Design a protein around this ligand. Sequence first.
Ligand SMILES: OC[C@@H]1O[C@@H](OC[C@@H]2O[C@@H](OC[C@@H]3O[C@@H](OC[C@@H]4O[C@@H](OC[C@@H]5O[C@@H](O)[C@H](O)[C@H]5O)[C@H](O)[C@H]4O)[C@H](O)[C@H]3O)[C@H](O)[C@H]2O)[C@H](O)[C@H]1O
Ligand SMILES: [Ca+2]
Length: 415
Amino acid sequence: KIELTFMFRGQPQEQTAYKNVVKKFEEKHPNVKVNIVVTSPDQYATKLRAAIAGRKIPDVFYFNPGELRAYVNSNVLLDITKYVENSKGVNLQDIWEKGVNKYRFDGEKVGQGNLYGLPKDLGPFALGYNKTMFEKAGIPLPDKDKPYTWQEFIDVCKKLTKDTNGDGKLDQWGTGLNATWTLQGFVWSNGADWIDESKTKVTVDDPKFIEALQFFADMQNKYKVTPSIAEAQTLDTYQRWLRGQLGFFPVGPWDLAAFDQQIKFEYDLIPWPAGSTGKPATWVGSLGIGVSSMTKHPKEAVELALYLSADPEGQKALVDQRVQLPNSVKVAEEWAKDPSIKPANKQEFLDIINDYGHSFPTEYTYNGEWYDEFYRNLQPVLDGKMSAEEYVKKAKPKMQKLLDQAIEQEKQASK
Ligand SMILES: OC[C@@H]1O[C@@H](OC[C@@H]2O[C@@H](OC[C@@H]3O[C@@H](OC[C@@H]4O[C@@H](OC[C@@H]5O[C@@H](O)[C@H](O)[C@H]5O)[C@H](O)[C@H]4O)[C@H](O)[C@H]3O)[C@H](O)[C@H]2O)[C@H](O)[C@H]1O
Ligand SMILES: [Ca+2]
């Protein structure tokens, strides 16, 4: 009788996994049929934005935590608090508090108050290294607790950069980090950030930010511990990591399934190299599972969100399928201690969540346009055509204008 539209995004292993778990949901609730709208991670924001613009909102949908307040003011997200409290068995007090709290809003500040969504996951972005490669090269393994310094990291990367098949051409490299997803840690580790403590002032022209940005680009251009610009163009560094060509690459729990399938070398997790603070940094992502404020079936919609987010059986199926770590803290802890589930240092994911992971800057602002502008024109720095110093001076006023507008519009839209 009842039909739900569930809209989400995922890499192909993620799509497959959630589609399976939705079938499990439907077997459990035979009167609820779930129509799926799924996209690649890159297509999602535009599609969700179109749906919201036309006020044709999916019953259940993935959404960015940074848009919680905007969604609440625009009446996009149903207040699901009472459905979640009335639900049989579930106790989201078991769920990561940092995850649950991202989708609470008391009318004024995020983090407390009524539920406008449930955490899909927490997504600590760990650093992986190719253990097979280290061992074939006789290089001492990275320490599982003590971060490399930046200097040490380049030193090891250089050792790993070599022509291994002896044809005269480099065919193996220290790393090849994607600035979109790996610049944060270097910036943060160096005691910088995109914006100030108040989250209202762009601070990318901070010397510490610049040093981190230049350091990042220099991996490719100056230190040359990555494939060349042309080589990464031919085959991107994620793919080259999969094929065993790179010493170092990040690992999210959502990668685990794809890696199970494609990676044949032994790899493990370590802290990110630490800058001037000496403490490692990286991000802990999250997605919200929200229900349309206008859904015709709030109870069943929340039931699907709950099943994906907090239900032991639903959660178990997702963890089994290697697309996330458990949302239940105690389950995650026993998960991490299980030696038969690789990577050996799974615990690093948890350590990121508890000790040294941060939020994306955009989680603190009303929208993320100011931040998207930073990355929109970053590539010339990344390719050594423009210095980090010259770009951030150019970008800052553009970013700041956009931040100001997001601040103004949060004033307006919440009146
Ligand atoms: O140029 C070649 C590129 O390489 C290939 O991508 C490799 C993938 O990219 C990296 O992962 C980045 C990102 O993560 C995946 O989504 C996971 C979800 O995001 C997490 O939360 C993240 C953020 O937090 C919130 O502020 C906001 O909502 C999110 O933006 C959440 O915990 C997870 O559920 C997504 O697929 C990917 O883009 C990894 O290295 C690897 O997976 C591509 O072919 C190409 O882009
Ligand atoms: Ca070679």
